[PDB]
Design an enzyme around this catalytic site. Structure first.
Site, mmCIF file in Angstrom:
data_model
loop_
_atom_site.group_PDB
_atom_site.id
_atom_site.type_symbol
_atom_site.label_atom_id
_atom_site.label_comp_id
_atom_site.label_asym_id
_atom_site.label_seq_id
_atom_site.Cartn_x
_atom_site.Cartn_y
_atom_site.Cartn_z
ATOM 1 N N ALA B 12 0.827 -1.201 0.000
ATOM 2 C CA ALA B 12 0.000 0.000 0.000
ATOM 3 C C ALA B 12 0.863 1.253 0.000
ATOM 4 O O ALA B 12 0.620 2.192 -0.766
ATOM 5 C CB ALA B 12 -0.946 -0.010 1.200
ATOM 6 N N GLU B 71 8.822 -8.151 -0.224
ATOM 7 C CA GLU B 71 8.660 -8.947 -1.422
ATOM 8 C C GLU B 71 8.780 -8.003 -2.611
ATOM 9 O O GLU B 71 8.328 -6.850 -2.533
ATOM 10 C CB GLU B 71 7.313 -9.677 -1.435
ATOM 11 C CG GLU B 71 6.841 -10.088 -2.805
ATOM 12 C CD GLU B 71 5.591 -9.348 -3.213
ATOM 13 O OE1 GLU B 71 5.025 -8.633 -2.363
ATOM 14 O OE2 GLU B 71 5.172 -9.482 -4.378
ATOM 15 N N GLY B 146 3.271 -3.490 6.098
ATOM 16 C CA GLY B 146 2.776 -2.154 6.380
ATOM 17 C C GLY B 146 2.565 -1.903 7.859
ATOM 18 O O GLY B 146 2.827 -0.804 8.355
ATOM 19 N N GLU B 183 -6.681 -8.436 9.483
ATOM 20 C CA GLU B 183 -6.270 -7.036 9.487
ATOM 21 C C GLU B 183 -6.645 -6.297 10.767
ATOM 22 O O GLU B 183 -5.857 -5.437 11.201
ATOM 23 C CB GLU B 183 -6.840 -6.334 8.252
ATOM 24 C CG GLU B 183 -6.131 -6.737 6.976
ATOM 25 C CD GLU B 183 -6.624 -5.973 5.777
ATOM 26 O OE1 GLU B 183 -7.759 -6.241 5.334
ATOM 27 O OE2 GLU B 183 -5.884 -5.094 5.286
ATOM 28 N N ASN B 228 -5.527 4.990 -5.642
ATOM 29 C CA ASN B 228 -4.265 5.640 -5.306
ATOM 30 C C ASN B 228 -4.171 7.032 -5.916
ATOM 31 O O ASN B 228 -3.662 7.958 -5.274
ATOM 32 C CB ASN B 228 -3.093 4.762 -5.742
ATOM 33 C CG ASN B 228 -2.978 3.499 -4.907
ATOM 34 O OD1 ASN B 228 -3.526 3.425 -3.803
ATOM 35 N ND2 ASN B 228 -2.268 2.502 -5.425
ATOM 36 N N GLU B 254 4.829 22.233 12.517
ATOM 37 C CA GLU B 254 3.599 23.014 12.528
ATOM 38 C C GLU B 254 2.359 22.146 12.347
ATOM 39 O O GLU B 254 1.257 22.583 12.693
ATOM 40 C CB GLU B 254 3.667 24.102 11.451
ATOM 41 C CG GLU B 254 2.627 25.200 11.599
ATOM 42 C CD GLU B 254 3.039 26.498 10.918
ATOM 43 O OE1 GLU B 254 4.214 26.607 10.498
ATOM 44 O OE2 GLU B 254 2.187 27.412 10.808
#
Ligand SMILES: Nc1nc2c(ncn2[C@@H]2O[C@H](COP(=O)(O)OP(=O)(O)OP(=O)(O)O)[C@@H](O)[C@H]2O)c(=O)[nH]1
Ligand SMILES: Nc1ncnc2c1ncn2[C@@H]1O[C@H](COP(=O)(O)OP(=O)(O)CP(=O)(O)O)[C@@H](O)[C@H]1O
Ligand SMILES: Nc1nc2c(ncn2[C@@H]2O[C@H](COP(=O)(O)OP(=O)(O)O)[C@@H](O)[C@H]2O)c(=O)[nH]1
Ligand SMILES: [Ca+2]
Ligand SMILES: [Ca+2]
Ligand SMILES: [Ca+2]
Ligand SMILES: [Mg+2]
Ligand SMILES: [Mg+2]
Ligand SMILES: [Mg+2]
Lengths: 352, 438, 422, 54
Positions: B12, B71, B146, B183, B228, B254
């Protein structure tokens, strides 16, 4: 085949709706923890709205509007009316009220005493009533000292509002009463008023010089059936329906229920629900909401209607469960999940 | 000028990063070969765009980015893609077998063997920086890399770069575009060990991106490419202030100062508009008020939830295109009188506003239509806690039966880390409630 | 480069494996001589998952053919695609296993196993990154059952962190060679419980009833049954042979508990020869989830699905796929455990099987599989309570205790499925 | 409704609007965690091999 779940077993109303849904042979009930549902008859408190509308391919509907408690809470309703420009502090159909926190915990103590001292000085009727949302605990008194001392003994937020000293009294009997209107708001925020209301009457003669005996002052169905001795004398179960009440208004006051009372009721229902529409509408939301409301009204000897409170989980009159519950399936459920008149509701048009 | 280093972890993060740098190049006029005709300082310069692009003597503008995946099939797309010439091999790190959607495999088993290599490649980019600000870390919640490897990398980054800010762009798991069942486990494990290491995190729910693609772009079954490209538009709107001349969100610090008064509550809600379908005949260009009003519509939020039933802690309006402050304040006034915008009593009821005159750039052939103006609103609402509740609930359903737990224990993770992570989330959900409800 | 090493053991294992390489070789455009002649690059994208690339652009399957007698493998070598297998990968003895698990596992098999592992080691040493192993075998015989599970045990010792998958044909008294098949099946199931990550349960009775009742085959043969298994093996392996993940990712998402890793496969369409008719997406979905289309001979409406994976092949409406799949779940949610959110996953593949515009393969981890192990257990106890036919096994060194323990392991496995069904 | 800190440049401008005023683990410790999980993996694989040796 539509799927629904039940998460409030104590709802006489939706227990019947669940009975009707299964009777159509087109609705299937699942366990109360199965997320793959079309319709949720959710619980009263802490309904997990945040978990609705996240199941791929399932349009989901729930029988409660997130945020509607602002209207169905004693202290919240007062705050909403006094701070919403749509209702204004000068709202003419809601009794003068004040939010009073107990001294062991903003608060409107001094504002109440100022208006109280003004009534005491001007020889005007200075009778108030104190109540809260944690009651079955109510006190009617003409001295501010007793009202405030009664709340400090408790620990929950309370509301003090003017007591309607000049209520309309049915005859014979010379007795008080209140009117319960059922209102259904569907996923499109159409306001439907059930054509059938109920007057929950007091079977005791209204006595204005003794607020200590709260049997002729409080017209609640549970009080009259527990502390009153004339229960069921004039009308069965202290419940007069619109047909009889309308005929009475014609023989006695020479008017109709529609002209003298129902116009004001319809106006009040709209004003309240249109007010919170931007805050609770599910029009552009990932799930849909509808809800049944129970508006309680008071009527004075001038035929002016006063709003008492709004109930978000109301029960129905035994004689109207069938007609109303079926109506809930027609306009609120099957409108989103169709199946394979002369409506029983009165649509209150408005501008969204 | 202070540099920013972008880190992309897992499929991702890599595929999203690839879409962003494509957009960045089109925005700054950088060609696929790295050349930038408008850059008159050859092989040097401390311009705003130099925060994201270094320069070689030959005029090439190289992203300050590192791609990491256990991978190699996703990163091989970059090595042979349109912008292959931008990156050199040291920036692209790939293993031989992934983490199998197993947090413990990404964090412990495989992470331990490759973490030092990644830090070494990051150190090389950091050595080119004269005043590194911090890192922008892209990754998914659900992936084993991820989630698992990111949490380990964030721990070491806090050790190797103590005084540097770190921001996340995290992809929240959505069943409609996922074939993994574990997940929820990975998302909560990685949030637990990453919480104290991230200064500000932008969660994007695939469910929201999916529905925007179907509703506004009329894509029947959106692909990762569709998702995406839309996601990189939002990311571009958020990082634009670091790449262009301006005075709002000029450095990474900031972002925390303006969006996160309470450290643990560092997940701002992103809302973007307008998303117009390019295939459309020709849309009526929307006004400042209409696009601003759209920022309070749930349908344009990166995470579906109801801000009407939370409290705001901060709020930034990032405009791009034909927008002048007069129209912004006019729309803001109109919305306060119609919407339910409840702020916490210990925070000002204000809106920091940034306007970039250059309108949103759209990838040729993409799905998004060119618009004259667009806005992205960053608001820290307690309403985003709804997403934690959803996720924590799914976690509880499986963990009550210990389903799939053996896969994690088998990679060396202790079972107690499950409940330790879950209790940290239960504390996070309580913090949101203490800040938002009465 | 995520290579898989294929192993086929015994009569059933080699005949089914033979057809399997026949089917997928066609799908990847490999001819009987290992030469590619397809027309789509999608055929070669993941070709190295199952084939080795030799000189002259030759594609040689990564398969090892094992048996304790030569007969069946001589057939394969003479079969349609027999020339395509690496000659060195034929490993066989001469004694046979006499349908005796003890001979395959302890005596005859142990004499031949080391030489099989030498070939396995050779194929692995040439893999860039070995995914894991797949074994096709029956549980009712002696070689595939006894020596197959012995091979699995020695493969797990030498590659402890590699995935071990099997396609296991379960015996049925309706399609039986010998009466000792329950003995051999019960002994193998415990080996599988311990040493495989995923086992596709193929019941010969389901294959039979499907050939008879559904396919309208009056007199089914083993060849007919193997047609069903071939088509099913091609379907369940589409995830691996085309772009769209790996064995360990599949196991992580399909196996919530280590011992409950026994799957029920399904295939659709199943048409008798009204064979040219187009099959809609709803039809694919209705059949694929129908018990008649399932190959474990277990009624899923008796238990509950822990996880479900479905693969659709062909050019179809992916939008219409989601609609029908979510229609099946949202119309029978009482058969899906509610404590595994989103436990039904769907994948699409654009390349259909030969001769079909579109098809669907079904991979279910269902607690109904306990009915299969119950049948075997009851048949086992019917004989073991009289010690009938045990001398074939005690004569090879086994003791009655090893049978008692296999019986208890089987009944424990059944009880484990029972607790999750409630 | 006030506008503060209005900064303008060639490529854009920024300002603030106020509608209402108000009312780690060391490198050593990380290595210990990583090596502890690796040790539990080694112990689990030893028991499997001890099981296969029996
Ligand atoms: N928006 C978006 N989401 C993605 C993309 N790729 C994967 N995802 C989501 O990420 C989750 C899966 O995690 P991955 O990033 O694919 O896994 P990983 O990080 O590569 O880790 P491994 O398990 O080792 O493969 C799922 O929820 C996917 O929907 C992408 O390109 N864009
Ligand atoms: N301001 C007021 N003046 C006169 N009577 C009042 C009053 N406020 C309440 N009452 C009396 O109290 C009764 C209703 O009390 P209230 O509705 O506040 O309690 P409750 O909410 O527990 C009953 P329910 O919700 O079922 O209607 C009515 O019968 C009405 O006569
Ligand atoms: N489906 C199928 N089953 C078979 C085939 N051959 C044998 N069987 C079954 O497998 C069992 C016999 O095992 P077998 O493979 O012949 O023994 P082995 O050669 O020693 O491994 C019995 O249950 C048979 O019904 C076949 O070609 N196809
Ligand atoms: Ca320069
Ligand atoms: Ca830090
Ligand atoms: Ca011998
Ligand atoms: Mg009440
Ligand atoms: Mg990956
Ligand atoms: Mg045989």
């Amino acid at each position: 085949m539509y799927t629904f779940v039940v998460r409030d077993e104590n709802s006489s109303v939706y227990a019947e709706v669940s009975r009707l849904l299964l009777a159509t042979g087109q609705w299937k009930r699942l366990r109360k923890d199965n997320p793959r549902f079309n319709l949720m008859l959710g619980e009263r408190n802490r309904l997990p709205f945040g978990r609705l509308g996240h199941e791929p391919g399932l349009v989901q509907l729930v029988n409660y509007y997130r945020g509607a408690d602002k209207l169905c809470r004693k202290a919240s309703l007062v705050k909403l009316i006094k701070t919403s420009p749509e209702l204004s502090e000068s709202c003419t159909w809601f009794p003068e009220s004040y939010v009073i926190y107990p001294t062991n915990l903003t608060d409107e103590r001094e504002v109440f005493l100022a208006a109280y001292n003004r009534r005491r000085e001007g020889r005007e009727g200075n009778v108030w009533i104190a109540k809260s949302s944690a009651g079955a605990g109510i006190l009617i008194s003409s001295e501010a000292s007793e009202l405030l001392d009664f709340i400090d003994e408790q620990g929950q937020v309370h509301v003090i509002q003017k007591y309607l000293e000049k209520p309309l009294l049915l005859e014979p009997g010379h007795r008080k009463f209140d009117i319960r209107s059922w209102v259904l708001v569907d996923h499109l925020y159409n306001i439907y008023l059930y054509r059938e209301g109920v007057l929950r009457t007091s079977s005791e003669p209204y006595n204005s010089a003794n607020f200590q005996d709260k049997t002729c002052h409080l017209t609640n169905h549970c009080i009259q059936k527990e502390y009153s001795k004339n229960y069921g004398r004039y009308e069965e179960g202290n419940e007069m329906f619109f047909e009889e009440f309308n005929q009475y208004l014609m023989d006695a006051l020479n008017t109709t229920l529609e002209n003298s009372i129902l116009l004001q009721i319809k106006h009040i229902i709209r004003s309240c629900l249109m007010c919170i529409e931007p805050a609770i509408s599910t029009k552009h939301l990932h799930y849909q909401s509808f809800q049944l409301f129970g508006f309680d009204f008071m009527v004075d000897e001038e035929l002016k209607v006063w709003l008492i409170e709004v109930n978000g989980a109301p029960a129905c009159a035994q004689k109207l469960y069938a007609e109303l519950c079926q109506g809930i399936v027609d306009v609120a459920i099957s409108s989103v999940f169709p199946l394979a008149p002369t409506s029983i509701f009165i649509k209150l048009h408005h501008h969204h | 000028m202070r540099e920013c280093i972008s880190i992309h972890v897992g499929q991702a993060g890599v595929q999203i990063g690839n879409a962003c740098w494509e957009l960045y190049c089109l925005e700054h006029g950088i060609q696929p070969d790295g050349q930038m005709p408008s850059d008159k300082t050859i092989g040097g310069g401390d311009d705003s765009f130099n925060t994201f692009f270094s320069e070689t003597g030959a005029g090439k503008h190289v992203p300050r980015a590192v791609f990491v995946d256990l991978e190699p099939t996703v990163i091989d797309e970059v090595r042979t893609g349109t912008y292959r010439q931008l990156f050199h091999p040291e920036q692209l790190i790939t293993g031989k077998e992934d983490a199998a959607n197993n947090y413990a495999r990404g964090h412990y088993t495989i992470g331990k063997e490759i973490i030092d290599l990644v830090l070494d490649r990051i150190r090389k980019l950091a050595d080119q920086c004269t005043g590194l600000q911090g890192f922008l870390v892209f990754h998914s919640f659900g992936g084993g890399t991820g989630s698992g490897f990111t949490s380990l990398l964030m721990e070491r980054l806090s050790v190797d770069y103590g005084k540097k800010s770190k921001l996340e762009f995290s992809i929240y798991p959505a069943p409609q575009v996922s074939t993994a069942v574990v997940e929820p486990y990975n998302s909560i494990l990685t949030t637990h060990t990453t919480l104290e290491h991230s200064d500000c995190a932008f969660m994007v729910d695939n469910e929201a991106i999916y529905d925007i693609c179907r509703r506004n772009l009329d894509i029947e079954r959106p692909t990762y490419t569709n998702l995406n490209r839309l996601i990189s538009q939002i990311v571009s709107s958020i990082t634009a202030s670091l790449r262009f001349d301006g005075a709002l969100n000029v450095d990474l610090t900031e972002f925390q100062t303006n969006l996160v008064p309470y450290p643990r509550i560092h997940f701002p809600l992103a809302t973007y508009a307008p998303v117009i379908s390019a295939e459309k005949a020709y849309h009526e260009q929307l006004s400042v008020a209409e696009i601003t009003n759209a920022c309070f519509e749930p349908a344009n939020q990166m995470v579906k939830c109801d801000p009407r039933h939370g409290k705001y802690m901060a709020c930034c309006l990032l405009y791009r295109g034909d927008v002048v402050p007069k129209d912004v304040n006019a729309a803001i006034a109109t919305i306060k009188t119609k919407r339910s915008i409840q702020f916490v009593d210990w925070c000002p009821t204000g809106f920091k506003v940034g306007i970039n005159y250059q309108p949103p750039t759209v990838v040729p052939g993409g799905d998004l239509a060119k618009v004259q103006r667009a806005v992205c609103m960053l608001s820290n609402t307690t309403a985003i806690a709804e997403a934690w509740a959803r996720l924590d609930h799914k976690f509880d359903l499986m963990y009550a039966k210990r389903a799939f737990v053996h896969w994690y224990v088998g990679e060396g993770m202790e079972e107690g880390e499950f409940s330790e992570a879950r209790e940290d989330m239960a504390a996070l959900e309580k913090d949101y409630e203490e800040v938002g409800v009465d | 480069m995520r290579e898989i090493v294929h192993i086929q053991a015994g009569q059933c294992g080699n005949q089914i494996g033979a057809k399997f390489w026949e089917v997928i070789s066609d799908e990847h455009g490999i001819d009987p001589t290992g030469s590619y002649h397809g027309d789509s690059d999608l055929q070669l994208e993941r070709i190295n998952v199952y084939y080795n690339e030799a000189t002259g652009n030759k594609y040689v399957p990564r398969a090892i053919l094992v048996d304790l007698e030569p007969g069946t493998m001589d057939s394969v070598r003479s079969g349609p695609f027999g020339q395509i297998f690496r000659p060195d990968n034929f490993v066989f003895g001469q004694s046979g296993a006499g349908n005796n698990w003890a001979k395959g596992h302890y005596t005859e098999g142990a004499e031949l196993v080391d030489s099989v592992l030498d070939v396995v080691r050779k194929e692995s040493e040439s893999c860039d990154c070995l995914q894991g192993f797949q074994l096709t075998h029956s549980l009712g015989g002696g070689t595939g059952s006894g020596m197959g599970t012995l091979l699995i045990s020695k493969i797990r010792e030498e590659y402890p962190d590699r995935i071990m998958n099997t396609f296991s044909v379960m015996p049925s008294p309706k399609v039986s060679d010998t009466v000792v098949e329950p003995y051999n099946a019960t002994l193998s199931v415990h080996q599988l419980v311990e040493n495989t990550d995923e086992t596709y349960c193929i019941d010969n009775e389901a294959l039979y009833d499907i050939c008879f009742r559904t396919l309208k085959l009056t007199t089914p043969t083993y060849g007919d049954l193997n047609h069903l298994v071939s088509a099913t093996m091609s379907g369940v392996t589409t995830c691996l042979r085309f772009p769209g993940a790996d064995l360990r990712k599949l196991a992580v998402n399909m196996v919530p508990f280590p011992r409950l890793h026994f799957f029920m496969p399904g295939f659709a369409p199943l048409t008798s020869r009204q064979q040219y008719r187009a099959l809609t997406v709803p039809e694919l979905t209705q059949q694929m989830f129908d018990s008649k289309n399932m190959m474990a001979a277990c009624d899923p409406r008796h238990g509950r699905y822990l996880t479900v994976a479905a693969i659709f092949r062909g050019r179809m409406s992916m939008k219409e796929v989601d609609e029908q799949m979510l229609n099946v779940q949202n119309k029978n949610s009482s058969y899906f455990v509610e404590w595994i959110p989103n436990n039904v996953k769907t994948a699409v593949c654009d390349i259909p099987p030969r001769g079909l515009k579109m098809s669907a393969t079904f991979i279910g981890n269902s607690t109904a599989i306990q009915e299969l192990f119950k049948r075997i257990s009851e048949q086992f106890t019917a004989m073991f309570r009289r010690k009938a036919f045990l001398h074939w096994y005690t004569g090879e060194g086994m003791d009655e205790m090893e049978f008692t323990e296999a019986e208890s392991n089987m009944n424990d496995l059944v009880s484990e499925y029972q607790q999750y069904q409630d | 409704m006030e506008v503060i800190e209005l900064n303008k440049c060639t490529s854009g401008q920024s300002f603030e609007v106020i509608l209402k005023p108000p009312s780690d683990p060391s490198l050593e410790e990380i290595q210990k965690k990583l090596e502890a999980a690796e040790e539990r993996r080694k112990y689990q694989e030893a028991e499997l091999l001890k099981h296969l040796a029996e």
